[PDB]
Amino acid sequence: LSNKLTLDKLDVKGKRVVMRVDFNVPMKNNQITNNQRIKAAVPSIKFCLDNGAKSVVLMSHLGRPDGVPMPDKYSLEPVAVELKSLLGKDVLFLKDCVGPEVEKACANPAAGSVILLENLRFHVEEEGKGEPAKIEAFRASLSKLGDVYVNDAFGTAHRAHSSMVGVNLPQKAGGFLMKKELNYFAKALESPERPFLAILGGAKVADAIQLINNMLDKVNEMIIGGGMAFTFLKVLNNMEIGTSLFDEEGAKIVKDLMSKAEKNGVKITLPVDFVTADKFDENAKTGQATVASGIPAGWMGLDCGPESSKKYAEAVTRAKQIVWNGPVGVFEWEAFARGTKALMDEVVKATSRGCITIIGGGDTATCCAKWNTEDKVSHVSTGGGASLELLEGKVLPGVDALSNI
Ligand SMILES: Nc1ncnc2c1ncn2[C@@H]1O[C@H](COP(=O)(O)OP(=O)(O)CP(=O)(O)O)[C@@H](O)[C@H]1O
Numbered sequence: 001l002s003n004k005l006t007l008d009k010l011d012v013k014g015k016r017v018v019m020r021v022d023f024n025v026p027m028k029n030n031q032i033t034n035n036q037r038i039k040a041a042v043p044s045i046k047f048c049l050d051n052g053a054k055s056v057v058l059m060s061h062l063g064r065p066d067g068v069p070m071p072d073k074y075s076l077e078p079v080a081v082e083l084k085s086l087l088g089k090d091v092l093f094l095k096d097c098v099g100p101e102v103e104k105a106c107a108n109p110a111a112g113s114v115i116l117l118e119n120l121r122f123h124v125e126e127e128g129k130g131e132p133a134k135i136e137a138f139r140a141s142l143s144k145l146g147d148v149y150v151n152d153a154f155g156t157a158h159r160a161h162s163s164m165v166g167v168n169l170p171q172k173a174g175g176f177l178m179k180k181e182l183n184y185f186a187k188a189l190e191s192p193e194r195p196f197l198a199i200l201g202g203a204k205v206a207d208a209i210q211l212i213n214n215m216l217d218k219v220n221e222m223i224i225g226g227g228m229a230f231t232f233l234k235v236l237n238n239m240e241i242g243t244s245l246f247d248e249e250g251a252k253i254v255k256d257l258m259s260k261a262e263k264n265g266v267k268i269t270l271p272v273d274f275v276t277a278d279k280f281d282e283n284a285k286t287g288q289a290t291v292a293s294g295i296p297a298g299w300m301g302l303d304c305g306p307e308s309s310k311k312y313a314e315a316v317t318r319a320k321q322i323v324w325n326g327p328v329g330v331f332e333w334e335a336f337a338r339g340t341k342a343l344m345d346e347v348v349k350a351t352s353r354g355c356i357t358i359i360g361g362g363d364t365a366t367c368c369a370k371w372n373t374e375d376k377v378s379h380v381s382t383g384g385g386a387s388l389e390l391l392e393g394k395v396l397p398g399v400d401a402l403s404n405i
């Protein structure tokens with residue numbers, strides 16, 4: 001951000017500040033399981049209030065509602081409540097993010113007002129798919145809600161979405177979390193300790209498989225776990241994967257990615273065994289499978305097994321630096337948590353002997369919180385996919401859209 005406006009040089013006294021934040025917090029049942037991403041934005045928010053901001057309007061997405069209002073499932077209202085105790089100040093929740101009624105609530109608020117808007121992805125124009133003149137109008141509406149713009153949404157900085165790249169105000173500044181996270185990665189990615197291991201898991205398989213190509217020019221080893229592994233095993237091993245996550249598009253480039261890993265001397269560690277489930281449910285009936293046995297029809301692999309855990313542990317022992325994005329099983333549910341807990345144990349042990357260990361992702365960061373290892377690894381990032389795009393060597397669209405100095 002050496003070429004960009006940042007919040008420390010933004011005059012906010014008497015100004016209304018509209019601020020993109022990443023409040024896409026994990027939720028189990030109906031409540032927040034991890035407030036990390038909300039806590040992480042507090043320094044920028046308090047800064048604005050302490051330095052005389054008239055208001056701070058906060059906007060974020062939550063989940064992937066795909067352009068339809070889904071306030072039953074994906075409302076930011078609970079975040080408003082959280083943000084109150086974290087700040088020491090009340091926050092006013094609006095049930096939308098645009099136009100006339102929100103614009104009114106934001107036009108001229110009482111001094112010191114903190115306002116949280118509803119999920120931006122309730123509108124198709126944020127993403128906007130899931131409409132050119134409406135997109136421009138959506139952007140115009142958001143722009144009216146402050147006099148100056150701050151983007152502190154590091155977690156979403158890889159997304160060229162309307163709230164991230166489309167706000168038209170004269171001053172667009174990166175916030176302190178954006179700065180912290182970018183500075184940490186610039187130092188850690190400048191001359192990584194080697195072997196440099198990427199650990200890839202999670203459930204955003206379509207997105208994550210498309211990052212592998214360029215990551216293979218940066219790392220010396222890769223674990224491909226969690227939900228992503230099934231696409232590779234089906235293609236490479238002709239493994240039966242039952243109802244496990246599968247990415248039909250990524251499947252078409254699996255053999256090319258393996259060839260490039262071979263060409264670049266990147267050792268790829270795929271799981272070899274699984275905990276299976278008869279349905280996607282915490283209380284599913286469970287089984288065991290190997291790559292050779294395959295997974296029976298109608299069942300899904302929701303964790304790796306012990307033999308995979310040993311292979312992952314071997315890769316970790318070799319590593320001098322690690323970036324881990326995506327749990328290696330459905331760790332929120334105890335029947336499917338063992339693989340991720342075991343890998344966590346190994347990643348903590350590596351740290352203790354000098355490995356540089358970087359954990360990224362809203363959900364993988366929740367692993368740290370669950371097993372109390374947030375201060376037992378080198379860095380827990382608010383970015384997941386965002387951090388991996390930095391590892392690929394890209395400029396993030398949400399940073400690119402900021403004002404130049
Ligand atoms: N085999 C599997 N099948 C289905 N889901 C799985 C899975 N293994 C892991 N998951 C799910 O992956 C989810 C997290 O994936 P995700 O891609 O969101 O990781 P993350 O949050 O660390 C990266 P990001 O910040 O980009 O969202 C968890 O909810 C976990 O239950």
Ligand SMILES: [Mg+2]
Pocket residue numbers: 361362363364384
């Ligand atoms: Mg996630």
